[PDB]
Design a protein around this ligand. Structure first.
Ligand SMILES: CN(C)Cc1c[nH]c2c(CCCO)cccc12
Length: 121
């Protein structure tokens, strides 16, 4: 669910999902069009694609369970939708973690008209 993914992002990064990632660039949160601005945005693009692979699942509301096994996120057994949503969100959090070194506040609240360039999943 949206709230769980926000917790997973805070644990990984130390940044609150809202407002650090909720409006970042051309793909994070509401959005998803044009050429991703940077590596963090590419994380959101992949995440957006990952959700798109699951048209009959509801990632905002569906709650999954996960644990930590060496500080590592480990998705636990639930429904097939919940399992698949978890793996999507786990990849995004890790991706954000991996790219904190290039995170830029200038891409926060990025303008929609500046998101141009087709990019398929
Ligand atoms: C409670 N709810 C309002 C939280 C929320 C809104 N947008 C979010 C994003 C967007 C980052 C990925 O697209 C990530 C994690 C949580 C949120």
């Amino acid at each position: 669910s949206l709230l769980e993914f926000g917790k997973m992002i805070l644990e990984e990064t130390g940044k609150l999902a809202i407002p650090s990632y909720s409006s970042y660039g051309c793909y994070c949160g509401w959005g998803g069009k044009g050429t991703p601005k940077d590596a963090t945005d590419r994380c959101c693009f992949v995440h957006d694609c990952c959700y798109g692979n699951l048209p009959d699942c509801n990632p905002k509301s569906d709650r999954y369970k996960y644990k930590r096994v060496n500080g590592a996120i480990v998705c636990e057994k639930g429904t097939s939708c919940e399992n698949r949503i978890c793996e999507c969100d786990k990849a995004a959090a890790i991706c954000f973690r991996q790219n904190l070194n290039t995170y830029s506040k200038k891409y926060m609240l990025y303008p929609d008209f500046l998101c141009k360039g087709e990019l398929k999943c």
